[PDB]
Design a protein around this ligand. Structure first.
Ligand code: CFM
Ligand code: CFM
Ligand code: CLF
Ligand SMILES: [Cl-]
Ligand SMILES: [Cl-]
Ligand SMILES: [Mg+2]
Ligand SMILES: [Mg+2]
Ligand SMILES: [Mg+2]
Lengths: 478, 519, 519, 478
């Protein structure tokens, strides 16, 4: 490796010295330094394994991955947090998966529905309560298109059968009632909740309109795996429509049960978050012969590449449209770069997020002349680390499921100029004097996808990196 | 589109013509209910007919106003020096506890899990407990690891005490580290029950073998319970110093939730020391400041420490602060400080100066049981009418006490108290009972929005007092107890009334005959 | 009409149908301009064309943002122990000074007149002074009668010094009463000039013949100038106690403006004593905390007392507080207290936590010269843009200093500074420059209203910081100086941004896609 | 006198024992105890004298009386505070003389227009600056109907001639431009400002439409002397219009220059505030043969008396209408007495206000069962004392131009249950533990006139007398 790689391998050995031997040996296989000639990680790193007990992992659970990430955003369905009261309260309106609608009336994403388990529900079981709950929900919320039941830890442990309840209630209501066995003890992170949710969508939603008429167009697509954080999916959809495509469905930011049911009628599936929804994209290719491709709408280099590749799946008319869209926004892009690149170039960034963004936002940073010196994921799999390798400079630190201890030690040694990570990391690193941007919630800003999003991204990285308060951490008399 | 000169975030970006057009076009692919039908159901959700149906619910909860036990054990644990909170069970719970407090305090929150998975469902979680204590000790070097549980651990019946005894026996946790524990099932009670259960665990670990003697130390202990205003821990210490009465708070997270941004991260800072907890049985007494939730803590004080557990009301408002200072003075034999009498008279001056804008105002309010009892008492003392009073996690014994208090006040004649009801119940009550204002936490913003959509005349503005406060910054610094906290509540209430009246009278040429300069 | 169960005050009584019909009927008897002509003129008053005509004014002043000298002399006088403010001249002035401070502080204000009437332009006011001093002394028993003047007195040319000596020599006022005086013409400068003039008078009375020696006492004197937040007097004393540096404030009205409502009216309370003022020349130095207005006070310190008068900026903000404490440390030789360094770090943590909502925000602001320079400085330090900056009573030297500070900052590139311009000028600037918010006093409410009447998109919300504050209660208790005051300003600014964003995003089904729970 | 009269005479001697002899002699002639047999005060009291120097009189000045009270409320004229900046700033929007209109455009009552005198204006005179100011006013405020010039102290002292400027500017603009020599050194109190202002209206306004056609009715009246505090004149005008009268003018609350110019065409002047506007009512009777009568719209006893006496000046149709209006509001009045009188009756009140309200509100207090134990005026004349005697119980303390010392000593000795006075008195008496209502500004409430005002008045006295905080001034350990 190069001098940077050597310095990072020596940092890995020093950071892991504190760990008891059993953990130390395990944790060593979750970090590496990148090689630009490598196309696959192979046995160079392992991921999607249990977390080490007691280390302050950043990860969540399978209920977060199913309720919080995949189903929670669908606006026209009521999602029941089934179990005790905690899980639904902590996850109520924490994720900015934007939608439009009339809250509590035709759209339900900011309400927290729950069966608030009490001790008698644990002793006697919750299925009778769940059935009665759904009756009461249909009375008070008549305009739901369908209902989901997101299981929390106790449900499977006490032996409840929510599938029998879902079948009985769906017949009585005459609407889809979808049971999900996403208890938080299953799997090792948010990831298994994604996969559970894709399999539930496959069996309980996606075949509901089979053999029904649907008026198609040659240029019908679906956005697969964009949860509209801060309006990200709207800022992407506008470009696809400007290029001449019809976006029939968006999964699942601002999404509906109806759009998801019409998705087997499209011509092409456009996957943005590979981690969370590659499973259903591969299923639709096998079963419905719909091709699918990965794309990236962060910053102008990736957006131009994606628009051209998407258009190349169609005909010369959409290929011409892709060029016209890029030329229409070229002025806007060159003005953003000319204003903000000079304020940001040469600065070094450390990134730590879930399953996509740690590699996906690198091109936007490079478009503003910034350099990524370390990138890690909470719950990514080895096919995601494979996908990260082309976008890393030689010797970069690439890591998986870091503890708080490890991220703090990496930051103290690497001295990034800027960190992008989550809410449990933000206030630690600001007190250490490092400019920090939340790269899950966008620090209450965004969108960051698309051309309109790149301007906001650039404004925000400049705002925080160059803020005057960063020169005041040390009192002037010290 | 964007311009370089004025970049717009999400709002108001999406107000632009091209996005309104996008939305109209996307609407056509959703099989949306027509706007007339959505209007009709919205209106019907504001009615008394819908309210009756809403109050027939026995299984569905919507927009709860409580959290689960281990959140409160985590907060109690953070108030002890060099203590790492540790929740035995599944890790998703700890990501959510940390996040929930991160967003209220705008601060880091240390807490670990031992990451029990499906493997631990049949074997039990004793391997996770052994490795978890071992790894947390090595990485974080705590003096105390304070262990609570998640619901998976409670359902499977993990024998917490035995697991920890095995970890000690087998060398996974060193003898220098204290490991107090408590069972904290999320399907019993709420976050306030978790706090009390954790406090009992600390009491057993640090004092069970001690032979105490009340009054050997001429001090009072104070126990706050679950409390998320930094100012309340600080005002209690400040008043006790003015009284010249030695004191210790038992669980005081105010330093670790307010560390300076000076280039260093301090996972531990301040807190009740081991010396303070170990010598607690020698104090004169321990005052339990949120009495409805400190139930096991009162049995500690009386049955383990053989202290009086002198009954005190939550020290919210003028009369309840006077009663706390009279109790401290009687127990200690020291007179109430002249500086405290001066502060009291300044609060009374403020109440007299602002009374014409508060008298007769109607409030809805919700929150934890001890807070709601204290705030209802102070509103009655101001001549306000607390017409809608809701506590999702309060019990029937508290409800009887609240109705006794209300029946004895001229200002409680129209008050209705609701327990085991949620914020979708509270929403209907704002539409049918229409108080002038509602006092609540950030979840109340959606109720204000819903009342405004019926019409400007029906809007019930939110006043933020409680937890969590996520959509305004630095309110967690404030004080709500003592005379200082009462000054903040009176100022907050009268200026909410005056801000709403200016807004109502700010229409040029129409309602601004009463847009008075002086109020 | 009125119903017994719900009686309506003026607003919203007059919204009732019978009064709307009454108003239509009265309008027919007024020869009212047509509604379209009134709308046309209102729209014209919001334009750049109207703005150019408005800035051509030489003689008319509309909605001034300053008051007259004696108001300031009265406030200075109130800060000395057992002092009765006395304004030699005509009585209508004193009714207005008392009323103006009554409505800001919500407190009584003692002040007398000697009721000079018509005959005094031929005879002079010596009889009034003699009888006034005699009667005030007998009824109110002051130790100090602090004399200033109304414009009548100044035009007539009454010789204060000679009247006061004549009163004492003839037995109208006891020789033991101190009777400092100052000439305070309302037609020169403003109320901050009267404060400085009155301070010079107290200094002559108590120190003219004294042989002082700087550093004989190891203390620092502090002089605040005209200041109407009680917390600023208090935070200075608290910080000096933490520094362990003895200090006197010279003029401190914070106790007589905050007496308790305890059944007794105290006309005198606290204040600088005669001993503190007489020993003031023996301190190490005297720190003048509002330097632009304390002009004769600086000549006192340097020419009478032979002290350095170490230059200090108004202690508003993080950097200016740091500089105050470094100056206190250098003059005293004592180290900055660890508790103050901790407080500083917590302020910085608040600034980092809230920076994404304040960076790039555009503000208009007006007030007295020292305050406006200090608050403009801190807004640059926060990464905000103070785009419209106005001080009606400031001069060209201050404007030059302001443009120098602005030019040097990354955040001052679109900033415009206006002197000798009033709030009708400021109203045009809010329409043409449209900052996000404006920081001002209660008179700003009319500008907020005016901008909203052009449209909701044009509204510039008011943030109340300054004087007077007549339409909200108890803001006068707040602190704006020190790290404590900066915490208030930061919290105030960020929550104003968040309140306005919530209001803008609270339209159900329209703008509430961005009505975020967490901000 | 009775036992109350005896105690009050003893209290008078005790209180004045603090005054030096020259003032003491003088002050004893400003207080008395009432006798129900007496019709006129005769030599028992003197009033409208200079205040004693240095005693803290509650009084203001002639500019307060002219600009603050009579002219400031007229909404369609711009009033210039001419002199240094202080006077117009302290009196900007302090008095709640309500009006409707569009601020700064067709109505100007909350703007503060001033000539902001500087030393050069004192030295060279202000008439050139005033002429220039009026040109700029007309450029920026084109919809004024007229302009007034309210002189502050310096103007007459430096020899300026604002009548010459007013004449020249009125020809230049073709609008009435009215000079007012209301310098605050003139007179002894607010009172002379009233008189000065009435004489100015007599000469510069009232003759402006003489000889011109005006469509009259038999029932045309003007409300003379109601400044619409909190909408008091609207709450009065509604009853007169309900009785079949046409209120052609209101002086000057919500008033206009136009209405004032049309006042010489009415059939009957209805004087509420006798002190401030009796002068112009007497003038209209002599010059225009328009009868005038005093009335009182505080509380149901006085309202009915007033409606019946006003209707008796017309014919049987208005007399029947008076009975119908009284009948229409009798249920509202009986409900207010039933709810509030039990909460207030027996309690004792002390009143201290300017020139009218100290006697005028006594009926309304008596309708709620309260008793007035002492009543005083800042600046009333002996004909106002004469008018007070019919509504006092024997041995009541009646006094004039009290110092703050004297009010405090009266309050301490008499121990009223409730005080009604002004803003300079409010916060002293609240600290002494006495419920206090501002009876000038209505403590930001009102209206108090009329049937709709009596409800508000009763609500407000109960709110403040019975507030729970008044039991908490002494700490419970003391
Ligand atoms: S941490 Fe995305 S795989 Fe999943 S909530 Fe964030 S880096 Fe998730 S891009 Fe997405 S919208 Fe996310 S930001 Fe895939 S959905 S489990 Mo936390
Ligand atoms: S103090 Fe009226 S003679 Fe005059 S402003 Fe009040 S008791 Fe005046 S009723 Fe009137 S509206 Fe008044 S309340 Fe005659 S106008 S100089 Mo201060
Ligand atoms: S992994 Fe829930 S927060 Fe927990 S103690 Fe149970 S109520 Fe409380 Fe995931 S599904 Fe949920 S969040 Fe945890 S419990 Fe499991
Ligand atoms: Cl309870
Ligand atoms: Cl200046
Ligand atoms: Mg923080
Ligand atoms: Mg007060
Ligand atoms: Mg009008």
């Amino acid at each position: 490796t190069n001098a940077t790689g050597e310095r990072n391998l020596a940092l890995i050995q020093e950071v892991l010295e504190v760990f008891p031997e059993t953990a130390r040996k395990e944790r060593r296989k979750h970090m590496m330094v990148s090689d630009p000639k490598m196309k696959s990680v192979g046995k160079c790193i392992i991921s999607n394994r249990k977390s080490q007990p007691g280390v302050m992992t950043v990860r969540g659970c399978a209920y977060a991955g199913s309720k919080g990430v995949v189903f929670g955003p669908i606006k026209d369905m009521a999602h029941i947090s089934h179990g005790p009261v905690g899980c639904g309260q902590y996850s109520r309106a924490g994720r900015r998966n934007y939608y439009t609608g009339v809250s509590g009336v035709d759209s339900f994403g900011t309400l927290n529905f729950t069966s608030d388990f009490q001790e008698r529900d644990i002793v006697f079981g919750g299925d009778k309560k769940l059935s009665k709950l759904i009756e009461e929900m249909e009375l008070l919320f008549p305009l739901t298109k369908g209902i989901t039941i997101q299981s929390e830890c106790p449900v499977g442990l006490i032996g409840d059968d929510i599938s029998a309840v879902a079948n009985a209630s769906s017949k009585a209501l005459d609407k889809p009632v979808i049971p999900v066995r996403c208890e938080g003890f299953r799997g090792v992170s948010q990831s298994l909740g994604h996969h559970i949710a894709n399999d539930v969508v496959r069996d309980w939603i996606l075949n509901n309109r089979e053999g029904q008429p649907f008026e198609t167009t040659p240029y019908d697509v679906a956005i697969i795996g964009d949860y509209n954080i801060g309006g990200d999916a709207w800022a992407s959809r506008i470009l696809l429509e400007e290029m001449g495509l019809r976006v029939v469905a968006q999964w699942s930011g601002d999404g509906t049960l109806v759009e998801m049911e019409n998705t087997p009628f499209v011509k092409l599936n456009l996957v943005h978050c590979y981690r969370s929804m590659n499973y259903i994209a591969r299923h639709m290719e096998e079963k419905h012969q719909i091709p699918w491709m990965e794309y990236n709408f962060f910053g102008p280099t990736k957006i131009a590449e994606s628009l051209r590749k998407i258009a190349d799946q169609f005909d010369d008319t959409i290929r011409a449209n892709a060029e016209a869209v890029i030329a229409r926004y070229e002025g806007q892009m060159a003005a953003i770069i000319a204003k903000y690149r000079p304020r940001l170039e040469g600065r070094k960034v450390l990134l730590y997020m879930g399953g996509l963004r740690p590699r996906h936002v690198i091109g936007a940073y490079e478009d503003l002349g910034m350099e990524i010196i370390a990138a890690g994921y909470e719950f990514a799999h080895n096919d995601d680390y494979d996908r990260t390798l082309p976008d890393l400079k030689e010797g970069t630190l690439l890591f998986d499921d870091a503890s708080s201890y490890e991220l703090e030690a990496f930051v103290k040694a690497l001295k990034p100029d800027l960190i992008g990570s989550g809410i449990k990391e933000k206030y630690i690193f600001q007190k250490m004097g490092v400019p920090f941007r939340q790269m899950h919630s966008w620090d209450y800003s965004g969108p960051y996808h698309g051309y309109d999003g790149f301007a906001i991204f650039a404004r925000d990285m400049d705002m925080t990196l160059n803020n005057p308060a960063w020169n005041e951490l040390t009192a002037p008399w010290l | 589109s964007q311009t370089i000169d004025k970049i717009n975030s999400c709002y108001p970006l999406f107000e632009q013509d091209e996005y309104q057009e996008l939305f109209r076009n996307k609407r056509q692919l959703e099989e949306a209910h027509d706007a007339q039908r959505v209007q009709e159901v919205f209106a019907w959700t504001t009615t008394a007919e819908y309210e009756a149906l809403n109050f027939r619910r026995e299984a569905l909860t919507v927009d709860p106003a409580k959290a689960c036990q281990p959140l409160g054990a985590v907060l109690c644990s953070l108030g002890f020096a060099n203590t790492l909170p540790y929740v035995h069970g599944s890790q998703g719970c700890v990501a959510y506890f940390r996040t929930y407090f991160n967003r209220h305090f705008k601060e880091p929150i240390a807490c670990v899990s031992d990451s029990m998975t499906e493997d631990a469902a049949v074997f039990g979680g004793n391997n996770n407990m052994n490795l978890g204590l071992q790894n947390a000790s090595a990485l974080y070097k705590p003096e105390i690891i304070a262990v609570s549980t998640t619901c998976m651990a409670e359902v499977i019946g993990d024998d917490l005490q035995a697991f920890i005894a095995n970890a000690k026996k087998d060398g996974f946790v060193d003898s220098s580290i204290a490991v107090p524990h408590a069972h904290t099932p999320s399907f019993i009670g709420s976050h306030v029950t978790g706090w009390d259960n954790m406090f009992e665990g600390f009491a057993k670990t640090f004092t069970a073998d001690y032979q105490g003697q009340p009054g050997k130390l001429p001090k009072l202990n104070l126990v706050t319970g679950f409390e998320t205003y930094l100012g309340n821990f600080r005002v209690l210490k400040r008043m006790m110093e003015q009284m010249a009465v030695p004191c210790s708070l038992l669980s005081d997270p105010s330093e670790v939730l307010d560390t300076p941004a000076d280039g260093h991260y301090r996972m531990y800072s301040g807190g009740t020391t081991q010396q303070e907890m170990k010598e607690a049985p020698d104090a004169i007494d321990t005052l339990l400041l949120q009495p409805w939730q400190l139930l096991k803590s009162k049995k500690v004080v009386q049955e383990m420490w053989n202290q009086p557990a002198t009954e005190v009301a939550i020290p919210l408002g003028l009369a309840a602060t006077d009663e706390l200072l009279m109790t401290v003075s009687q127990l200690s034999g020291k007179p109430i400080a002249d500086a405290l009498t001066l502060e009291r008279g300044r609060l009374v001056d403020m109440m007299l100066d602002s009374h014409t804008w508060l008298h007769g105002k109607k409030f809805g309010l919700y929150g934890d049981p001890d807070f709601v009892m204290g705030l209802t008492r102070f509103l009655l003392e101001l001549g306000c009418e607390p017409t809608v009073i809701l506590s999702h996690n309060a019990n029937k014994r508290w409800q009887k006490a609240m109705n006794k208090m209300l029946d004895a006040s001229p200002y409680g004649r129209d008050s209705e108290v609701f327990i085991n009801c949620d914020l979708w119940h509270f929403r209907s009550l704002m539409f049918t009972r229409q108080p002038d204002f509602m006092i609540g936490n950030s979840y109340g913003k959606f109720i204000q929005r819903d009342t405004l959509a019926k019409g400007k005349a029906f809007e019930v503005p939110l006043i933020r007092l409680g937890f969590p406060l996520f959509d305004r910054h630095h309110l967690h610094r404030q004080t709500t107890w003592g005379y200082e906290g009462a000054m903040n509540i009176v100022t907050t209430l009268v200026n909410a009334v005056l801000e709403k009246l200016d807004s109502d009278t700010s229409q040029l040429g129409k309602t601004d005959y009463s847009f008075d300069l002086v109020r």
